[PDB]
Automatic annotation (TrEMBL), chain B:
Name of the featured protein: HAUS augmin-like complex subunit 5
From-to range in the entire protein, with total length: 411 to 462 of 666
Organism: Xenopus laevis (African clawed frog)
Gene name of the record: haus5.L
Length: 50, 52
């Protein structure tokens, strides 16, 4: 009984960890919709600087 | 000779009796220990799982 409950807890834990990882990824600011273009030209935008 | 042999036999039997007495006393203590081990396993290892 102890081995069986142990397996169920592990499966739930692995699923829980994977979910947290995905949520963290989806909350990345660069992925989030059309923030109003930045008013300042990004240092990485070489064309606008030129 | 028979009487002597018989006396030896009685002595052997007597020894066995003394062994069984000890044996049964030990078994009784063991049964108490074994009972305490199973209860301790349920309390320490199984009862905490529902919370996890």
């Amino acid at each position: 009984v102890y081995r069986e409950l142990g397996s169920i807890v592990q499966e739930l834990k692995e699923s829980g960890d994977k979910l947290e990882e995905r949520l963290t990824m989806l909350s990345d600011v660069n992925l989030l919709s059309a923030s109003k273009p930045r008013s300042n030209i990004d240092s990485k935008d070489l064309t606008s600087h030129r | 000779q028979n009487i002597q042999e018989a006396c030896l036999l009685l002595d052997k039997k007597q020894k066995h009796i003394q062994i069984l007495i000890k044996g049964n006393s030990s078994s009784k203590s063991q049964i108490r220990r074994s009972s305490v081990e199973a209860q301790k396993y349920v309390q320490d290892k199984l009862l905490p799982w529902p919370q996890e």
